[model samples]
Target: GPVIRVAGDSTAVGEGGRWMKEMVEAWGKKTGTRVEYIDSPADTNDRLALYQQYWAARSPDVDVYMIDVIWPGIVAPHALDLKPYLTEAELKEFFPRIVQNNTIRGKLTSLPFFTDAGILYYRKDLLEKYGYTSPPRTWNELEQMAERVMEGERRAGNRDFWGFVFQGKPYEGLTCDALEWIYSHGGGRIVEPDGTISVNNGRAALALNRAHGWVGRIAPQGVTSYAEEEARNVWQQGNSLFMRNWPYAYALGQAEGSPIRGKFGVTVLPKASADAPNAATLGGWQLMVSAYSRYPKEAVDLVKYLASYEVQKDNAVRLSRLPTRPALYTDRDVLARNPWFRDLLPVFQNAVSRPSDVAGARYNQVSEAIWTEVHSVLTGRKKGEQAVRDLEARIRRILRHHH
Candidate 1:
């Protein structure tokens, strides 16, 4: 038996850490291996830097690597190919799209550890007060309802009231929110199933335009600076009527000190057009074995255990971490602990992965450009059409160059 080492982000720390520990314990008992969990910086940028340092240094100490969904492509050259160990039966137990994400250039580089999907957090009490019977099914209705709420707040001298809020910061968070709009409005960031660049279309343009409109009409001017924590703080403060965020916000919103606790509700992301399809960008992390691992077999065994039904269920019960395994959704205890799962289950069931390909760096660049252009349009610094055209040109150039 060999010792296994693990590295990861904050989600991979406390609750995530506990879940991983549980998996390691189970694995150790069965395989007689000692599992060591190493804590890395909680920040994504810092985590990536650490990952590079470990891999570049070719350290054999870190046996397992917990990576972001977007990272495999960049790290593939430094990670072991796991396809040889992954059986068809084991792969069938996980989400097919997630499995595809871990596969780069026909090699399975990692395993999907958990799953995440964009969700709309709304003020259920306010909606009912406004005589709204159901959650807004489309963006138009969402805007109308939010506007009505904003009007009521203004009349009552609640100048701080916001209708909707989201991540608009110049980073990956922005891209995540932007992707939802792009998809729901009959647009896609890249060609589906095959991962070709495709955000330059009119449908993508409409999604970007609608995102700017929402910011202009309902979001605070300061949203351009918001990241996940900042945006979640605003929602928790009870100043906002709606938020586009992940299921993790559900627990935060329900915390005792949160004024909006128990007053909020979760729903599927709103669609752009009634005739169009609705979608949410999948967001989560996975665990992979570094190519430098001296004990690949041990690392692989741990990966299998971490993604098993037992560990995933414990993760949900303890930390409210959304499980990737579909079977966990039907677990009675899981439902009892996190009723929010009942709402998120359907969201995840129908969710789609963001545009993924071997060109991970290119994807990040295009996404950043889209975020900046979105901010420009919202701030009135650029017209929606002009911003869209600029983005399209830039994306086309990158795609062509990379191709």
Candidate 2:
């Protein structure tokens, strides 16, 4: 039996410890192979740097890597192109945008394992109590609804309640959050596909200002330090009327013994106006084989097996990892386990992808500029308009070097 080492974060290895080992071992048993796990750092950028060091040395120690969604363009040259191994029909089974994202200049660098998008999670009980029949569809509606419910909850003795919570830390998560706001407001991406810099503008300023208004009015002052889990912790404690997070929060929020179980409903993030379209930052992980690996065949087989329909469905049910397959959204078994998948289908279908492909190795720098500037606004260090101007200047400097 051939032994293979798979490198990934806790989600791929298992959330707690060795959760994925048992599943991989079972797969190994079925395929007459031995599986070993190489745990990577939890932070995406740190993990990418580790992989860069390994690949720079042409190390063949690890066979497969669970890659971040935005990594393909940066690591494509060091990754085994899967086009020769995967058929056109098989590749078509994955989500279209995911396929597009993983394809770099016609090289199929990776296969998507699971996909992610930001969504709004609102308290059903609170909305109904406040006479709102449905979740807010526009940013204005969200503000009004949140303000009304927050005041009512406070009057009823729940002074600690907040209107919303989300990832606002100065990191990639903040880039995702800022993109949603900018895009939903009809503001273009910080860096366009044609490599244009366009972060400072009236629409973008309006979006950031709206978010700034939430700092003291609805969101807590400490929200600027919150990451995904931190925001989830607050929302799951029944302290917020709405939250912006990925699908993973859904299962945890509804888990047995959870305080807010059965009290929340998931929907797409609100738009800035009635005419604007809802936007969710495209996110998820993909599986890639190292070009320097000795066991490329076995690694490819493992990738195929993990991305298989059966495995994806199981992952969705057990771990709440959203599948990359469109069909899985409507699968009876999947829907039966995660009914929210049905409602979130459109959100996933229309999710907005980051400009990682265009920015390539410079993507991290671009994202940092966005988050840093947005963080300044959130922290009161700079006004929204000024932050936007600073962001554009920073991005220009970064892109000048790239070009």
Candidate 3:
């Protein structure tokens, strides 16, 4: 029997003792093979660094890597191209944007396991109490509603209540949050599709300025240090009126023992205007076979098994992960168990990708530049206009040096 080792974050390998490892083991048994799971760092940037170390040395011990959506361009050379292994019909089963993200110069580098997009989580109870019926449709509306709710909650004895919370820590999470604000305002991308630098603009400045106003007014001062779990912890405690997080937070928020269970609702992130487009950062993991793997055939088989419709649907049903297959969104069983998945179909379909594909191996540097400057503005260490100006210059320098 062939032995294959797979590497990924806890979510990919079954966070909170879920079904990922169990399902994979079942497949291994059915195929007369052995499977090993290597736990990677929870932070995406740290996980990327670890994989870089392994691939740089050309280690054959790790047979497969669960890659970040933005990583194909950087790691594709060290990952076995899936174009030869995947059929056209199989490729068409995934969302087109996801397939496009995984392809680099026409080579399919990975198979998307599950997909993710940013979303708004709000206190449904609070909205009803305030005579509001639906989530805010625009950023201005969100601000007005959140301020009113926060004030009402505080006057009602919830002295520590806040209006909104999201990832603001200086990491990839900050980059995701910042991109949502900029893109939602019709601002330019950090790096354009044609590899042009265009982060400094009036719209970008306005977006950052709006986010900066959230500090100490609507958002807590500590939010500047918050990551996904940090924001989740605050929001889950019923201390905040709204939150910006991914789909995973929905399941956990509704879990049996959660304090805010049945009190919250999820929706697409608010836009800058009624006509402005909604922007949710494209997110998810991809399964890539290591170029140096000895059991390449077995590894590819495992990847295919995990990505098959049955397993993808099972994972979505059991884990609340957003499936890569479009059909799963409408699957009766899937929607029955996680009803919000149906409402979020439009969000997944319209989500935006970062400029990782254009930045290539220099993506980490580009993201760092973004988060660092934007975080400075959020923390009041720099003005939003100054941050955008500095960021644009820094990114231009990075691109020039790389090219």
Candidate 4:
């Protein structure tokens, strides 16, 4: 039987799947054990369903699980306790929040693999053309600048140019963006440090209204139908003055044949309210040793090899995969190769994790309901305030079910 079996999304698979192959080979070379890699889509929903199936079936074939950050609450009970397997030195290397997210009842359930943080991407040339010398720090400033660009573009005979664009579609993508406003405006999906439902708070309602309102004012009418690719495409085509996306979009936009290639600028997203703090929802996946694995030692060894500084730094430069290990950011050679990461350091530093709950499957349901109301608001079928109130009522009902 194989000693190590890995299950994960694209980042775990690597570029052209070659990077992952190299990683597996490297692990075998370091640990003198055979390792198997099972590649899966980056779709969070599909991967989660697979995890649930594997866990329920008690499948031992999958030795290691690269679970989503949100899975700790649901998977923790079924996952192997790693506290005894990990060394003090290895455990100390992780960030506090990273460790906290994967721990359940004081037992470590997984290792923090890689990370993703939100960053602001804007049109530098357009801003300069409009006599702007700096980026916006507040939401009001961002609105004013983007509106100016839109007006300027119209005056210059470019009617297709837009003020801003975002992933406002009715799905997980919408919730991802919405969470940013919730945090920035001193609100959140759930109460901090606990899984208590708090989406109906005054600040939370204000945040939702503002986000829904902004989508109506600036984004295209079709934006309510957009996800990651749709929003990125709109910005990359030079049709929008600003965009909010993960680090991956920076590399893709600069690639050859992109309409906005070599013309994009990166910065942190603006704060929404005065008391609001700048925050982006923490994303990306982590690797965990399955409780049903017959070969826990081999699984731990494989994870250790993958977490090595050499491998982390290599992945960061070659695949634009942000390393979870904080020390990797200080590597001059790595930073030079991925200048976008160096520029995004501040944004990453300010990143915050989302509230995790035992109702893992239900999180998506709640997100869908909120996005539906938001879409209606953006499409002029409902007012922002009315849409938010409706969403709050829906969330309350859903929360009661989980409670």
* Top model number, TM-score: 3
Candidate with maximal lDDT = 3
Can you write out model 2's per-residue Cα lDDT over 64-89, one digit (the tens) per residue? 88888988878888899999999889
By summed lDDT, the worst window of 10 consecutive residues in model 4 runs over: 9-18
lDDT rank order: 3, 2, 1, 4
Candidates by TM-score, descending order = 3, 2, 1, 4
Each model's C-alpha lDDT? 0.77, 0.86, 0.87, 0.74
Candidate 2: list runs displaced more than 4 Å.
Answer: 11-19, 401-403
* 1-403: candidate 3 lDDT, tens digit per residue: 6678888756532252236567668878889888887777667888899999999999998998889998988998888988999889989999888888889888788898899899999999999999999999999999999999998999999987999999988889999999999988988677788887877888888899999999999999999998888898889989999999988787777778899999998999998987777889988988899999998898899999988899888877766788999888889999998898987888878888788988988898899999999999999998889999999999988888665
Q: State candidate 2's TM-score.
A: 0.94
**Candidate 1 positional error at 101, Å:** 2.0
How accurate locally is residue 225 in candidate 4, as Cα lDDT from 0 to 100? 79
TM-score for candidate 3, residues paired by index: 0.95
Model 1, range 151-193, lDDT digits (tens) per residue? 9987899878889889887767777887788788888754344
